[PDB]
Write a protein that binds this DNA or RNA. Structure first.
Lengths: 49, 300, 57, 207
RNA sequence: UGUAAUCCCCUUGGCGGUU
């Protein structure tokens, strides 16, 4: 993840108008899928996909 | 005796500190405590200490043998002859002492080694002497159906793995519990797995790597006490399914052995660990045999 | 930890002792905390010094 | 074969904590890690995840009247001595009193009977190593001054011998780096050494 | 006691700024 803050994003991954933003803040939240690793061994669904 | 290396290296925490300044230790009592003599020899081989064997009555033997050997003459010529004889006898004693010391040292070494060998043999026999767990209402020697549940460590992100094996010794089904073990969902899913699928395991084994497994054991015991999960008995005070801890040296070694990988190429390491635990419960002797060479590295 | 040397196959070894900094903690003679990689000198004996590689008990 | 062997409290403790009952018992000092600080108690964690607690009577010295939070904080590990062990519940109580954390030195139970133990040799080696500890190192002092000269007492007197009456030389004193000896010629073949005590010294070589 | 995160193209092209 980026070192900025994701707390200004809404549920849909987009910031809302009227919100003050600073440098390195995340204004668009996007993720790309990755083939899962062998973490399904003992991770309680908390594995990076 | 202590060399300079012994003077500096024998610390209060080192195992060699037990005999840093021992003195006049009886030989006959050494055989009852072989490890002390073995450790003294080991320290000697390290160039730290020197083991010395001495007799309190050595002068008595020297004087007696001199009296046997000495002449009874009193003339100055006889005095010179007696002096020559005594000096040669002292030189002979000087030459003879080290060989006798070495022979006695070797004898005590062999005795202590044999004693410790027998002790290790008895310890190993005690370790590997245990029949498989006997389920109630069955004769001794019957192989029970077993279910193993484990999560390993218990850090945030540690799911609980379950592996069930029948009396045949073949894996029947493996399940994952991906919810928190303290949630109602975990207990409900475990109860459904236990009852609905007709698994009916005779004994449940729980093991781990740290104290976090204790909470899982307590939670499982409470669940068993709450849902009255009695064992199915083939055709009436039905008995509850036992939940115990399992020793896991063989399981730990099996989770790393390539034999498991060849046997189970598409299974996680925790599944292999649970399978090893279940096989140990079914038959400890065969699991101890499966160690092959790594059995010698067990703490016996 | 005893000071001896052993030779074993990779299979025989149990596992690596993964310890967090909350577990791998060292305290010197005076009671000051000393962490991984710090340089300390033996108080007595050979009075040697070196960098800490791992802390156990 | 005997029936299946069920682990007991000691065996379960050894299996889980990987710590033997002998190595973890009363009268042992371990570097526990402070996890929570409270006014009436402190909650600490050992190396082997064994949670521990100390009642307020022992975090601070009985003479001191400070607060536990001011002296000790989270993340500040300290030495502690085991008082009680709950093997079944993996709970232990600790003491921070120096009568345990410091006085407990010869914790081994090795029989020191003079008949079979050479107490005299161990004592002699003990004063040998203690005298070695007392041994230290010292070096010379360098001062920059026109009338300062690194000479002995006799050396200073001989240096002033070739000089007329009243000339002054300055040399380091034997009473310490905080002292200075000043030698001046009272009369032909007559010299006075005066010791000067230094205060508020910036450095050993400094004035 | 639940304990928070560290990483970024490359090649071309254009348009500019200061001399």
């Amino acid at each position: 993840l980026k070192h900025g803050t994701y707390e200004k994003l809404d549920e849909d991954g987009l910031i809302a108008p009227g919100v003050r933003v600073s440098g390195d803040d995340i204004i668009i939240g996007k993720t790309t899928p990755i083939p899962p690793d062998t973490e399904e061994l003992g991770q309680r669904t908390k594995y990076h996909t | 005796e202590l060399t300079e290396r012994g003077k500096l290296q024998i610390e209060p925490e080192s195992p060699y500190f037990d005999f840093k300044y021992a003195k006049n230790r009886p030989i006959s009592a050494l055989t009852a405590t072989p490890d002390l003599y073995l450790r003294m020899i080991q320290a000697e081989n390290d160039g730290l200490v020197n083991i010395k064997v001495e007799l309190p009555m050595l002068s008595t033997v020297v004087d007696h043998f001199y009296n046997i050997l000495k002449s009874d003459g009193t003339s100055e010529i006889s005095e010179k002859w007696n002096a020559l004889r005594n000096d040669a006898w002292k030189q002979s004693l000087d030459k003879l002492i080290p060989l006798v010391q070495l022979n006695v040292k070797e004898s005590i070494r062999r005795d202590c080694e044999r004693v410790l060998y027998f002790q290790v043999k008895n310890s190993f026999t005690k370790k590997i002497d245990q029949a498989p767990y006997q389920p109630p209402t069955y004769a001794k020697g019957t192989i029970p159906r077993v279910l193993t549940l484990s999560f390993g460590e218990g850090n945030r992100g540690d799911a609980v793995l379950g592996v069930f094996m029948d009396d045949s010794g073949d894996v029947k089904s493996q399940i994952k519990f991906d919810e928190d073990f303290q949630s109602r969902d975990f207990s409900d899913s475990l109860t459904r797995y236990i009852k609905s699928n007709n698994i009916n395991p005779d004994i449940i084994g729980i093991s781990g790597f740290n104290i976090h497994t204790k909470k899982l054991f307590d939670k499982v015991n409470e669940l068993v006490n709450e849902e009255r999960l009695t064992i199915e008995y083939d055709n009436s005070d039905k008995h509850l399914i036992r939940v115990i801890y399992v020793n896991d040296e063989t399981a730990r070694l099996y989770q790393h052995s390539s034999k498991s990988s060849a046997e189970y190429p598409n299974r996680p390491q925790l599944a292999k660990y649970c399978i090893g635990l279940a096989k140990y419960i079914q038959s400890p002797l065969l699991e101890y045999l499966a160690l092959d060479e790594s059995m010698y590295s067990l703490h016996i | 930890s005893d000071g001896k040397l052993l030779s074993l196959p990779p299979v025989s070894i149990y596992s690596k002792l993964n310890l967090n900094p909350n577990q791998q903690i060292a305290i010197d003679s005076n009671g000051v905390e000393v962490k991984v990689g710090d340089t300390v000198r033996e108080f007595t004996g050979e009075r040697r010094q070196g960098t800490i590689l791992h802390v156990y008990r | 074969r005997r029936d299946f062997h069920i682990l007991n409290e000691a065996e379960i403790f050894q299996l889980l904590t990987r710590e033997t009952v002998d190595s973890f018992r009363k009268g042992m000092v371990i570097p526990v890690y402070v996890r929570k600080v409270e006014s009436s108690y402190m909650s600490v964690s050992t190396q082997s995840l064994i949670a521990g607690n100390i009642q307020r009577q022992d975090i601070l010295e009985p003479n001191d009247r400070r607060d536990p939070r001011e002296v000790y904080s989270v993340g500040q590990t300290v030495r502690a001595c085991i008082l009680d062990v709950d093997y079944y519940n993996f709970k232990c109580q600790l003491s921070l009193l120096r009568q345990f954390t410091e006085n407990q030195v010869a914790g081994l139970n090795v029989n020191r009977n003079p008949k079979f133990w050479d107490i005299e040799s161990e004592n002699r080696d003990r004063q040998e190593e203690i005298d070695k500890q007392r041994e230290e190192s010292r070096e010379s002092r360098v001062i920059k001054h026109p009338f300062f000269h690194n000479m002995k007492s006799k050396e200073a007197e001989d240096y002033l011998a070739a000089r007329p009456v009243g000339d002054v030389v300055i040399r380091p004193s034997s009473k310490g780096s905080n002292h200075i000896t000043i030698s001046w010629k009272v009369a032909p073949q007559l010299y006075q050494h005066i010791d000067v005590l230094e205060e508020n010294k910036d450095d050993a070589n400094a004035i």
